[PDB]
Amino acid sequence: SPRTLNAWVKVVEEKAFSPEVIPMFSALSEGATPQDLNTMLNTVGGHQAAMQMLKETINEEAAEWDRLHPVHAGPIAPGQMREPRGSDIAGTTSTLQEQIGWMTHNPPIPVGEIYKRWIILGLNKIVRMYSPTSILDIRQGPKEPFRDYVDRFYKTLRAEQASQEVKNWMTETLLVQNANPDCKTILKALGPGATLEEMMTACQGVGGPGHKARVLAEAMSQVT
Amino acid sequence: SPRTLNAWVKVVEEKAFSPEVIPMFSALSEGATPQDLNTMLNTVGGHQAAMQMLKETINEEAAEWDRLHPVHAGPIAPGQMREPRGSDIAGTTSTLQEQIGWMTHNPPIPVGEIYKRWIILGLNKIVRMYSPTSILDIRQGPKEPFRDYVDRFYKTLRAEQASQEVKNWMTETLLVQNANPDCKTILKALGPGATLEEMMTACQGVGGPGHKARVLAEAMSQVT
Amino acid sequence: SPRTLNAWVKVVEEKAFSPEVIPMFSALSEGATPQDLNTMLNTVGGHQAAMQMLKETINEEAAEWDRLHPVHAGPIAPGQMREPRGSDIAGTTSTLQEQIGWMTHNPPIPVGEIYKRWIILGLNKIVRMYSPTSILDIRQGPKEPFRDYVDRFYKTLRAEQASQEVKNWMTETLLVQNANPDCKTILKALGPGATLEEMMTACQGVGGPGHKARVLAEAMSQVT
Amino acid sequence: SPRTLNAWVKVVEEKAFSPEVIPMFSALSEGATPQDLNTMLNTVGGHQAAMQMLKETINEEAAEWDRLHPVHAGPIAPGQMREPRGSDIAGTTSTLQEQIGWMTHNPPIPVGEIYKRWIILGLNKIVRMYSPTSILDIRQGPKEPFRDYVDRFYKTLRAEQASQEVKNWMTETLLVQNANPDCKTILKALGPGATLEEMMTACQGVGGPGHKARVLAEAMSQVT
Amino acid sequence: SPRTLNAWVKVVEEKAFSPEVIPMFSALSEGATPQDLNTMLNTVGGHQAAMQMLKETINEEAAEWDRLHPVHAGPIAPGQMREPRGSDIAGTTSTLQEQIGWMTHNPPIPVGEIYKRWIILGLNKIVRMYSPTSILDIRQGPKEPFRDYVDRFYKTLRAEQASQEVKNWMTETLLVQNANPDCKTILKALGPGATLEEMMTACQGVGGPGHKARVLAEAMSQVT
Questions:
Q1: Chains that touch C (3 or more CB pairs under 8 A)
Q2: CA distance C35 to chain B (A)
Q3: Of A167, B217, C116, C185, which one has the fewest beta carbons inside 10 Å?
Q4: Chain B from 69 to 108: CB within 8 A of any D CB
């Protein structure tokens, strides 16, 4: 049902790729047509590296299935259902009718369950080798233009799922907190009544010769 | 058998590409169908440069076999088994039936043993020209952002095979030990009760003008 | 497939008997013949207490199944498939042909799924009541010969899964760190340029009357 | 040939279970009847834990072969050679005639080769998990009677392979060198012109109340 | 013969692409089938730029031969041997039978000798325009991380042909000698009893702000 799909998405929305989703997946799916499961796959939030590695793994295993099983056919009378092939197990190249015709036919060749095993194993691989990134993990290096940082922060911000108040509040907090000590000092040098442009301009002053000269002079001044 | 496969994997798991695996390979395999051996190949831990050079060598030698042996056929009556070709020796393009049909047929043309010789020689080439990397070998250059270092260390960490306690213990130890003297000093400047974020922020302060100015000032201060 | 087996082994290799393996197991298996599953059982790393308790639980439950279900047969004409018995559910005493003949026959009596439930429950019991041991957990008591300790440490070391550099590095670190304060003092009494033998001999001197006399005398010296 | 057997023994005599014997084994054997190979097994120097683990592994793998392959026979006319069984692959229960009759018959079912693979894998397991002990590794604990030590040393001495001069020379050297500092001091308290009995008696004095009292008194004396 | 091939390889092993190999080539080959010569080509140590330029030159000259000689055929009765084409002169696209059939046929069209002339000219071009690199020629620039240098040195080391003692001896010597004066000073600042890791760490300290500040301070100190 659609609510099951939304439920899956809800399971994916949080605790993403924690050692939870695999059994929840296997427990929620309980078998499906390869198309419906491929839909249950593609209906997610559209992750990049995860789904990349997913299609990779699935494709490789499909190729392995293709290699291991030649399953030559013909010249038998076209009265039978042929046989599933590694590319056929995928949602592509196949139709629901023959799929039901397969799953219904006996012996019960489990193409969908095998695909489920495949996507499960792949999902496990992803769970192991994938490390997600949050907005709190965004920080600027030792020296970079603040423009790229704020741009990166905003573009990264809109990618994260949250409310508006949570968004702009976190924007404020993380933006002022996660800045480099230098820029942070230059930002905190004045009262927090300034807008973004002012801080950006204050940060635009950074990186220039006058900055380094001023800091170096001040350093040698307080030192000597 | 599967345990033989797992045993091979176990032999590959440690002492990887030491002057051990070649005879152990030849001694464990004791001949196989090209498909089963190709499986015994692809069933490994999924190394990159090794298997790259492997497929490279195999492909080249296959091409050499193709070039050296034209072995034209026809117009003989299709009552015989044809002849193996360089691309046929590989697991691809071939089926187990004709392979057994070949190995069983006399004179005993050894396609699998030749492929074994090929993969052996290739594996030797790999053994010679491949230098593996451990987690202990991970170190940061003279000046780099600590973010890339910790990210590299973690992503490199999860790639290495070990236990959880061993993992995070080694994480702690190698992370604090393998740091640059500067960052290491900045890290050891405070008691080791801080989390990763604190050290990251302390390392985020590095690379800026204030840092260099402070160190330079301190240097000229202790000098003059 | 073999890769599924290696995948299971990989799942067992780390996070062993954490609240992960049960759903992963049930999700990866998706049902199997009792023989293939018994293979999937015996193909593991060869744990002792776990598999012990496993065979125990399975045997007990099998006995319970034997007791609860007399299922007397005869004198029916030998045209039917008989019925599964508790000892028959196990991989032993049974053949794949009749097993497929059973699973294929209707009503679909689920012997393999029941065995899966059994091994699952047993695996859960193991997950609950089993505490694994690492190399870091190895420590010598208040007074023992260092020989037994280093022997235990080495024999315990080779049992743990890791790389060579990781092995000998951990060997060094854990060996020097996990020693008793006394022996550790006697070990750190000299520069860490000595080999194992020197430290062993230094530790061989411990426990004798001269040692206790020296320490006691020194104690009474610094006291009085 | 016998010289091949003696050569194998010679290969076993030194570098025992180093990462050498496996290729040398597989290369020297070049296939054999299970009886002749079982002889090549039992003809060794009669090691304990190694051969123990060997028979263990072989028996387990044999049981696995028994389980995996029911290979039911009958009611076929007794004109054929039956089929090898896991217990049959071993030197026991089988005769050379049927073995040659098997290996000669086609398709060439490789029983001896499989047994070779088995003993190879087992030998690898032994190579990994077995740590041999030398005479140099013999040392007395913190406090033990010297009688047990010299007895252990002698009984351990005769077990090691060497010449007579090498034996008694090593006896002298290792006996005087590997002793505990206390006993070593008591031994070196006099010129090395004494026989074993004198040192034994001198060591017999150790462990008593007078000894500990004397050492403790001397300690407190040099201290206070 | 094979020894002639190994002899060629031996001629290539040293004095590579010196004004020697061309006449030695022409004198050793003394004509060959294009396949055997193409083998005599590909059987070398697998050089990169040389063989690159070689295939380049050969391909270009082949294209020139293709352009200059249209040599249209047909509709002659297929009783004759056709004619060699630029792509046919190469080992590819041709078989030994027709090649011998050509060389044997009169007038003696010299395809192999022409190919020999081609590869000779190409080899001359290579001799002129190719400058080989040794391990002694490996040096680090004014400022680079020592990691890349040692990695480059090792990977370059294993590429060079020499013995083990020669290898590691040259490793030591060239590694300590070819280092930059700065790093060399930092390396020679301590006794040459340190391992690679220590020097690497000492070199890891280089490039940072503290380094430059220290050197600059010391400079201004000794200056002022």
A1: A, B, D
A2: 13
A3: C185
A4: 104
- Determine whether the interchain pair B30/D107 forms a contact, defined as Cβ–Cβ distance below 8 Å: no
Q: What is the 3-state secondary structure (H, E, C) of chain A?
A: CHHHHHHHHHHHHCCCCCCCHHHHHHHHHCCCCHHHHHHHHHCCCCCCHHHHHHHHHHHHHHHHHHHHCCCCCCCCCCCCCCCCCHHHHCCCCCCHHHHHHHHHCCCCCCHHHHHHHHHHHHHHHHHHHCCCCCCCCCCCCCCCCHHHHHHHHHHHHHHCCCCHHHHHHHHHHHHHHCCCHHHHHHHHCCCCCCCHHHHHHHHHCCCCHHHHHHHHHHHHHHHC
What are the residues whose beta carbons fall under 8 Å from the beta carbon of A209, sequence distance 6 or more?
none
* CA E191, chain centre distance (Å): 38
Q: Is B67 on the interface with D (CB under 8 A)?
A: no
Q: Write the secondary structure of chain B as one string of H (helix), E (strand) and C (coil).
A: CHHHHHHHHHHHHCCCCCCCHHHHHHHHHCCCCHHHHHHHHHCCCCCCHHHHHHHHHHHHHHHHHHHHCCCCCCCCCCCCCCCCCHHHHCCCCCCHHHHHHHHHCCCCCCHHHHHHHHHHHHHHHHHHHCCCCCCCCCCCCCCCCHHHHHHHHHHHHHHCCCCHHHHHHHHHHHHHHCCCHHHHHHHHCCCCCCCHHHHHHHHHCCCCHHHHHHHHHHHHHHHC
Chain B residues within 8 A of C160 when measuring between CB atoms:
163, 166
**R_g over Cα of chain B:** 27
Q: Which domains does chain A have, with CATH numbers?
A: 1-131 (1.10.375.10), 132-224 (1.10.1200.30)
* Number of residues written out for chain C: 224
Torsion of CA D213, D214, D218, D220, to 10 degrees: 10
D32 three-class SS: coil
Q: Which residues of D touch C38 (CB under 8 A)?
A: 67
User: Residue A175 has which token pair?
Assistant: 């933006």
The reply to whether E166 touches chain B by the CB within 8 Å rule is no
Contacts of residue C3 in chain A, CB cutoff 8 Å? 61, 64
As a whole number of angstroms, the distance between CA D25 and CA A159 comes to: 62
Q: Compute the count of residue pairs across chains C and D with CB atoms less than 8 Å apart.
A: 77
| Residues 6+ away with beta carbon under 8 Å from C114 | C89
Question: Does A184 lie at the interface with B, CB-CB under 8 angstroms?
Answer: no
CA–CA min distance B99, chain D (Å): 14
**D with A: touching (≥3 Cβ pairs within 8 Å):** no
Judge whether B174 and B135 are in contact, CB under 8 Å. Answer: yes
Do the two chains B and D touch, given a threshold of 8 Å on CB pairs and at least 3 pairs? yes
B215 touches chain C (CB under 8 A): no
Q: Resolution to 1 decimal, in Å?
A: 3.9
Separation CA D165–CA D49 (nearest Å):
29
Exposed e or buried b for every residue in B192-215, given b needs 16+ CB within 10 A? eeeeeeebbbbbbbbbbbbbbbbb
- Nearest chain A alpha carbon to C19: A19
CA distance C74 to chain D (A): 24
How far does C205 lie from chain B, in Å, by closest CA?
32
Nearest chain A residue to B222 by CA distance is: A223
What are the backbone angles phi and psi of residue E85, rounded to the nearest 5°? -120, 160
Q: Which residue has the tokens 């992370």?
A: B175
Selected for mutation to probe chain C from D61, D131, D137, D139 (highest C CB count within 10 Å) is: D139
| Residues A55-73 as b or e (16 or more Cβ within 10 Å = b) | eebbeebbebbbbbeeeee
> Tokens 């590909």 label which residue?
E42
CA distance D24 to chain B (A): 9
